[PDB]
């Protein structure tokens, strides 16, 4: 059935990176990049 | 699965799968830079000495 | 400063466990962004807009 | 100085292309490049199909 | 076995299978070279400013 | 002459009739081939040389 899918990564800039207000943020959205 | 700037090799393929690169690239030098800037009126009495 | 030109060719791709389920049609995916061309402009998005 | 190293450019990219009449452009059939730019959506690239 | 400079496209993907891709390009525009072209007058007052 | 830059991202590869046995191996060797970079040679043989 639907389940959550493990996606793994790195922080890399541009690739991931951390928001400026990740702090606040929960999940998924704390990230950003390509 | 793995979505991230991970280069793909003989080596990795021989233990799980890949798709189609997205993004070619190859191996590159990085240095540091001399930044000399353009003068002004010292252009014109650059050559000799003061 | 970068130098040099390339050394040779070798890109990013997605990674997926041998015999994962998705591959395929991630793959597919990323084939029709490919053809739909948003991806050098998310490249631009990333790297040249700032 | 006093060189004839000019080398004039008569068209710069597709934009010149597509905003120019006297030089005609086409391609190769049954090949790929004609699926790409039918299926193009890209403005300029639109127009130049 | 296609063995052949081919392009890769998502419709030729949906019929058959492709390695990975060995071999990166873009589209090309070719023209016709024009001659080197000689300044004439304007070699008076070319260089050095506008 | 070439003019412009390239348009977009895209590459040869070997196609295989869709379901056949051989591409898996012939994906490997083309791996091996390309970290062993002799294809790079052959591009100078065939582009560069003559």
Sequence with gaps: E???????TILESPYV????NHEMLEGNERYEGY | ???????????????????????????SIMIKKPQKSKPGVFSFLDPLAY | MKVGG???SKGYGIAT??????GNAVNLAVLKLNEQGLLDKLKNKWWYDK | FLTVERMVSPIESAEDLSKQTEI???????GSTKEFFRRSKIAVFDKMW
Excluded: C, H, Q, W
């Design chain 1, 2 to 8: 639907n389940k959550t899918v493990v996606v793994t």
């Design chain 3, 6 to 8: 390339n050394l040779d």
């Design chain 3, 17 to 22: 466990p041998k015999g994962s389920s998705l």
């Design chain 4, 24 to 30: 005609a452009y086409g391609t190769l059939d049954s």
């Design chain 2, 1 to 27: 699965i793995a979505i991230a700037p991970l280069t793909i090799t003989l080596v990795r393929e021989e233990v799980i799968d890949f798709s189609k690169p997205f993004m070619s690239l190859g191996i």
């Design chain 1, 17 to 20: 990176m951390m928001k400026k």
